[PDB]
Design a protein around this ligand. Structure first.
Ligand code: MG
Ligand code: MG
Ligand code: MG
Ligand code: MG
Ligand code: MG
Ligand code: MG
Ligand code: MG
Ligand code: MG
Ligand code: MG
Ligand code: MG
Lengths: 202, 159, 293, 176
RNA sequence: CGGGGCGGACUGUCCCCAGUGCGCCCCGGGCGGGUCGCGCCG
RNA sequence: GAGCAGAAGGGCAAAAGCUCGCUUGAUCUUGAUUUUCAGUACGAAUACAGACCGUGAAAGCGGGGCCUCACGAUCCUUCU
RNA sequence: GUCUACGGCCAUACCACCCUGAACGCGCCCGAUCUCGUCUGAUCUCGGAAGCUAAGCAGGGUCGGGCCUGGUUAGUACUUGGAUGGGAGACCGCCUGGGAAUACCGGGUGCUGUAGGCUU
C-alpha cells in the first residue's frame, strides 16, 4: 500500500507543506516526538547524544516513527523507563504525491509526509545520566538502521538539550546567568529592568 | 500560459517598504522636473493614477514634457531584438531625480574651475580619471614585533 | 494573567508611526497636499497661502509658500500686536480677526512696494468685494486661505481674517456663504449684520444686554473691558481708528533685548558614566540593605 | 494643610454626562411611549438605538428601533443623580464601579421618583450610568491637538468610591 | 596611569555619608602627525 | 488584526472605510501615449488640451467604480 | 536655554511609568447674547479671563520595551566562472572572484528651515 522509500528518498520537489493549497493530506505516522522523562528538570540529564545525518535526503514519517520506537525499546530496557528523555528533532512537513494509475493530468494527490534533512542536522536527541553514554550510543546506533541514508552519533558538548556548553553550565547557573525551568533554562541578560535583577539575586 | 494583465507579477514591485506605508511625503511633490533632466522611474503603489508599466520600474529616462501632475519621459525599452525610445506619461510620485547626472555635473564645474585656475597660475594639472593604478612600492615596518604565526585549526565537529 | 496583551513586543516591532505633526494633531496632510502643491508646469511659482490660526489668547495670520526645507513666511500678523494702536482689549474675536487680517494685508503689500495701489476698501462694508489687477501695474497678490483643522461653518473667525485681508487688497478666492451675514434658509447674504460682526456690534449689544440686567455677572464676563472704560458705545469708532491706523502704518518693528544671561532652565541629559554609576550604587545599596537584615 | 491644598482646584472629581438609557426588545407604540418618559424625566428629547445583528433568539432584526437613551450634563445631571440615588437610598453596594472610574445602577420603576404615574405611559425601568471626570478630560475629545490625559490624572475605582462617600455619604462594599 | 583649586547630578553608609559626568585654567606621563625641523649612520 | 460588490494580489486611518449634504465628469470634442504588440487592430488605461458643468469657503477634485479582468471587425440593419 | 505658528526628513521622533517647569506662549478654564451645531454648548461655533499647571505640552530619568547604529555570528551560509576533481549516487572538496541574516554583546535616542515672542 506504500511505495518503497527509494521512490521519495531525494529532496527534489520544492517544499510542499500542508496548507490551504494542499488539502486532503493524510495524517503523518509520527505524532509523539518526546518520550521518557520529559519532566526531568535540567540537572539529572546533563549528557546529550545526537543522531546527525550527513546526507541531503528526506526521511519518511513512518521511518521516523519506526526509529523512535526502536530507540524507546532499548533505552527503557537498559537505562530504565525513567532514566532518559528522547526528542525527535525532525517533523514530517513535506508532502509527497502519487500519480495513481496515462501521463495526461499527471499531477499526483498527497499520499504521505516526509522530513527533509541537510548534511548537518540532528534527527534524534537523547538526554540522560552521564554514565549512560554507552547505552545512548547503542540506542542511537540501532535506530539508525531504520533510516535510508548514513548517519553519525555525536555526544554533544552541551548540557542536555540546553544550548550552553556543559563545562560552563554549572558556573553560570551558580552566578545566575541561567535559571532552570522546565526541561531547559532561561538566559538572563543583564540589560532589563533593575527591579527584575533584584527579584532575582535576592 | 500566464495572463497579460497590466499588473501581473507586481506583488512586491509596487508594494510599499516595511513601516513606510500611508501618507506620501510632500517633498516628493515640490521637486522641480525641468525638460531634459534625467529621472528614475520607480512606480510607488500608494498612488494608482499615472503609474508606469512594470517594464519601466527601475529604469532611467529623460523628461521631455512637463504637465500639471505628471511628466513625459523618453525611456529606452528593449523589445526582443531592438531598443526603441518609448515616451510615457508618469505622475511625479513614481519618479525621482537621477543623481548619476547630478554627480557628473558637479564634476564638470569642478573641471571648469580647475581649468581656469590652471591657466591663471600657469601650471599643468591632470583632469581625467584613471582606473585605480597598481600599488606604488612601499615599506612595511615590523616595529620590533615578530609577525604572528598562523596555522590551520584542527577539525572539530560542532553541529 | 487573564487577557492577551495587545501592546506586546511584536506590536512595537512593526508599529509604523505617523507624521510628527499629524501625531501632535496640528497638520491635516490630506488638505495640506492639495493646498501647497504647485502645478508642475510652473517650476518655481510659489503657491501663497494665508494661514489663519485662532488661539485661546491670540490670532495668527501669515502668508507662506512651501519649499523642500520647509515653509517660508513672507509676512505675519498677530492679534497681540493690535493694542499698539486703537483696540487694546477684546482680542481673539471676530472684530479682532478682521483687523489682523487687514493688518496682514497692509503690511504685506507695503513690503512689496504696492501699498498705494490696491487700497482695497478703505470704507468698510461687509459685502462682496474682490480686488482686480490694474493693467500697466503689477498684478494683485493672489493667495488661498488655509483654515487648518478648524470646522468652516458659517460665521467662523477664520473667515473674518479673510474679509480683512481681502478688504486690504489681497485677491483671495472665496464666497460670501461662510460669512456671519449669510442666512442658510433663504440663501441670502444680508451683508449688514456681517458689518456688525466686523465692528464687533454683536459683542457690543452683548455688553449693553448685561449692564441693564446684571452687574456682577457683567463684570465677571467683561472684566478687562471695564478697565480703561471700554463701553459698548464708541466701540464702532475705536475699530474705525484701528482700521485707519493700520492703513497709515502697517510696518512691523521688533525690539532689541540682548542683556540676558546664559541661564539653563532645563536639566542636561545624564551621561553614560552617570547612568552606569547610578545602577552601580543601586546594586550595592540593595545588597547592603539586604545584608543589614 | 498646605501640603495638600495645592492641586485641589483642578483635580476635583466632577460628574460628566449621565447617559441614561432605556432598552426595549421591540419597536412601535410601546417603545414610543418609553421615549416620552425621557422628556418627562429630563426635559430633553432622546435618541433611538438600532440593532445591528439579527439574532432571532429573543427576537430582533437589524436596523430596528430597540432602545432610547439621552446624556445629561450640568446641574440637570446633578439632580437626576440624587433623584435616582434617593430612590436607592444611597446604596450601591459592591461592584457597580468600573475600573475606569465610572459607575452605574438600574432602577426597576420610574414612577416612584420622579414624574407621577400616567396610566397612558407604561411601567418602564431604566439604568443610570454616571461617568466621572476632572477639568482637562475634554482634551481627549478635542479636534485640534488631541491627547491622552496622563496616568496620575485618571480616575480609579477606589477614588471613584471615595468621591461617592465624600459627596453623598453612600454605603459601599457590604461584608458579603 | 593622573594630580589642584569652581557649577550640577546620583546612592537606603545621607547632619560626621559616599560615588559620576561635564566648566575654567595650572600641571604629570606615554602615544601619533606635520615642522628650515637639527644632527648622525647606510 | 475591519471594510472597500466579486477571485487573489497590491493600496488606504481626521483614508480609498462608515454616516450625512449637494449633485450627474457615467456629458460634448481633437489629437498624443501606455499595455498585448508585428510596436497592427480591438479592449482597457495614462497625461493633456478645448467646452459645458458638479462640489467645496477655497486650494483643488471629478470626463465612471482605489488599481490589476469584466468583452467584439467588414457587410447589413436601427436610431441620433 | 527655550517656546509659539507653519513645516522638511517621518520612532535616534514611538509606547509605558516617575520627577521638574522661571517668563512669554500654548492650554486647561468660565459662559451661551450674537454666528453656528447638537438627544446633551460634552465635541463644533461664538463671547470671555476668576482660577491652575492637575492634565495636554516641554526637559530629564528607567541595568525599561521598541527604533536607529555598530561588533559578533563569519569569510560562515549562499554564490559568478573552471577542471577528463572525488563519490554508485546523494552530495562534497578545491581553483577564480563576490559575500549575507538571526541568537548574543555594545553605543545612541530627534536633526533642522521660515516668521515671531520669553529668558538682566
Ligand atoms: Mg516492488
Ligand atoms: Mg520535480
Ligand atoms: Mg504560468
Ligand atoms: Mg497564472
Ligand atoms: Mg480611477
Ligand atoms: Mg478639510
Ligand atoms: Mg470650480
Ligand atoms: Mg477639461
Ligand atoms: Mg532598551
Ligand atoms: Mg568560494
Amino acid at each position: 500500500g506504500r511505495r518503497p522509500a527509494r521512490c521519495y528518498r531525494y529532496c527534489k520537489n520544492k517544499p510542499y507543506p500542508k496548507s490551504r493549497f494542499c488539502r486532503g493530506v493524510p495524517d503523518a505516522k509520527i505524532r509523539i516526538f518526546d518520550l521518557g522523562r520529559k519532566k526531568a528538570k535540567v540537572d539529572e540529564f546533563p549528557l546529550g547524544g545526537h543522531m546527525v545525518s550527513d546526507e541531503y535526503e528526506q526521511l519518511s514519517s513512518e521511518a521516523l516513527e519506526a526509529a523512535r520506537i526502536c530507540a524507546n525499546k532499548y533505552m527503557v530496557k537498559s537505562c530504565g523507563r525513567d532514566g532518559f528523555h528522547m526528542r525527535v528533532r525532525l517533523h514530517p512537513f513535506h508532502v509527497i504525491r502519487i500519480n495513481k494509475m496515462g501521463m495526461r493530468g499527471a499531477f499526483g494527490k498527497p499520499q504521505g509526509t516526509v522530513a527533509r534533512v541537510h548534511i548537518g542536522q540532528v534527527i534524534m536527541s537523547i538526554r540522560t545520566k552521564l554514565q549512560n553514554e554507552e547505552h545512548v550510543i547503542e540506542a542511537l546506533r540501532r535506530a539508525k538502521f531504520k533510516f535510508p541514508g548514513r548517519q553519525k552519533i555525536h555526544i554533544s558538548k552541551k548540557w542536555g538539550f540546553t544550548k550552553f556548553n556543559a563545562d560552563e553550565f554549572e558556573d553560570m547557573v551558580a552566578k545566575k546567568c541561567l535559571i532552570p525551568d522546565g526541561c531547559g533554562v532561561k538566559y538572563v541578560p543583564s540589560h532589563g529592568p533593575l527591579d527584575k535583577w533584584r527579584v532575582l539575586h535576592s | 500560459t500566464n495572463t497579460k494583465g497590466k499588473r501581473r507579477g507586481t506583488r512586491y514591485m509596487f508594494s510599499r517598504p516595511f513601516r513606510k506605508h500611508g501618507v506620501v511625503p510632500l517633498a516628493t511633490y515640490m521637486r522641480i522636473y525641468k525638460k531634459g533632466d534625467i529621472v528614475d522611474i520607480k512606480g510607488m503603489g500608494t498612488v494608482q493614477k499615472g503609474m508606469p508599466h512594470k517594464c519601466y520600474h527601475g529604469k532611467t529616462g529623460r523628461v521631455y514634457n512637463v504637465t500639471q501632475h505628471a511628466v513625459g519621459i523618453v525611456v529606452n525599452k528593449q523589445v526582443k531584438g531592438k531598443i526603441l525610445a518609448k515616451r510615457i506619461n508618469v505622475r511625479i510620485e513614481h519618479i525621482k531625480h537621477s543623481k548619476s547626472r547630478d554627480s557628473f555635473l558637479k564634476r564638470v564645474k569642478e573641471n571648469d574651475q580647475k581649468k581656469k585656475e590652471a591657466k591663471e597660475k600657469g601650471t599643468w594639472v591632470q583632469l581625467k580619471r584613471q582606473p585605480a593604478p597598481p600599488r606604488e612600492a612601499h615599506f612595511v615596518r615590523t616595529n620590533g614585533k615578530e609577525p604572528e604565526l598562523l596555522e590551520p585549526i584542527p577539525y572539530e565537529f560542532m553541529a | 494573567g487573564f487577557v492577551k496583551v495587545v501592546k506586546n513586543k511584536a506590536y512595537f516591532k512593526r508599529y509604523q508611526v505617523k507624521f510628527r505633526r499629524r501625531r501632535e494633531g496640528k497638520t491635516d496632510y490630506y488638505a495640506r497636499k492639495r493646498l501647497v502643491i504647485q502645478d508642475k508646469n510652473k517650476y518655481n511659482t510659489p503657491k501663497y497661502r494665508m494661514i489663519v490660526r485662532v488661539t485661546n489668547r491670540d490670532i495668527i495670520c501669515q502668508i507662506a509658500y512651501a519649499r523642500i526645507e520647509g515653509d517660508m513666511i513672507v509676512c505675519a500678523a498677530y492679534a497681540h500686536e493690535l493694542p499698539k494702536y486703537g483696540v487694546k482689549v477684546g482680542l481673539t474675536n471676530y472684530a479682532a480677526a478682521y483687523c489682523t487680517g487687514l493688518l496682514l494685508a497692509r503690511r504685506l503689500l507695503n513690503r512689496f512696494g504696492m501699498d498705494k495701489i490696491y487700497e482695497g476698501q478703505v470704507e468698510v462694508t461687509g459685502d462682496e468685494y474682490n480686488v482686480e489687477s490694474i493693467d500697466g501695474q503689477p498684478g494683485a497678490f493672489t493667495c488661498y486661505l488655509d483654515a487648518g483643522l478648524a470646522r468652516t461653518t458659517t460665521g467662523n473667525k477664520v473667515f473674518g481674517a479673510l474679509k480683512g485681508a481681502v478688504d486690504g487688497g489681497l485677491s483671495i478666492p472665496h464666497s460670501t456663504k461662510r460669512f456671519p451675514g449669510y442666512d442658510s434658509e433663504s440663501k441670502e447674504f444680508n451683508a449688514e449684520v456681517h458689518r456688525k460682526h466686523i465692528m464687533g456690534q454683536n459683542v457690543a449689544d452683548y455688553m449693553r444686554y448685561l449692564m441693564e440686567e446684571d452687574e456682577d455677572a457683567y463684570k465677571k464676563q467683561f472684566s478687562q473691558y471695564i478697565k480703561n472704560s471700554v463701553t459698548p458705545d464708541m466701540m464702532e469708532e475705536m475699530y474705525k481708528k484701528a482700521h485707519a491706523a493700520i492703513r497709515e502704518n502697517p510696518v512691523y518693528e521688533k525690539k532689541p533685548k540682548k542683556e540676558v544671561k546664559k541661564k539653563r532652565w532645563n536639566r542636561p541629559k545624564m551621561s553614560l558614566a552617570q547612568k552606569k554609576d547610578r545602577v552601580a550604587q543601586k546594586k550595592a545599596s540593595f545588597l547592603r540593605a539586604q545584608e543589614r537584615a | 494643610q498646605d501640603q495638600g491644598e495645592k492641586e485641589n482646584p483642578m483635580r476635583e472629581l466632577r460628574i460628566r454626562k449621565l447617559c441614561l438609557n432605556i432598552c426595549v426588545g421591540e419597536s412601535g407604540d410601546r417603545l414610543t411611549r418609553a421615549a416620552k418618559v425621557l422628556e418627562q424625566l429630563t426635559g430633553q428629547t432622546p435618541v433611538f438605538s438600532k440593532a445591528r445583528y439579527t439574532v432571532r433568539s429573543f427576537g430582533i432584526r437589524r436596523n430596528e428601533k430597540i432602545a432610547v437613551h439621552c446624556t445629561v450634563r450640568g446641574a440637570k445631571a446633578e439632580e437626576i443623580l440624587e433623584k435616582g440615588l434617593k430612590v436607592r437610598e444611597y446604596e450601591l453596594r459592591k461592584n457597580n464601579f468600573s475600573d475606569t472610574g465610572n459607575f452605574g445602577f438600574g432602577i426597576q420603576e420610574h414612577i416612584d421618583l420622579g414624574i407621577k404615574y400616567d396610566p397612558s405611559i407604561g411601567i418602564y425601568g431604566l439604568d443610570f450610568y454616571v461617568v466621572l471626570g476632572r477639568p482637562g478630560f475634554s482634551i481627549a475629545d478635542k479636534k485640534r491637538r488631541t491627547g491622552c490625559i496622563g496616568a496620575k490624572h485618571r480616575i480609579s475605582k477606589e477614588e471613584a468610591m471615595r468621591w461617592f462617600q465624600q459627596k453623598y455619604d453612600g454605603i459601599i462594599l457590604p461584608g458579603k
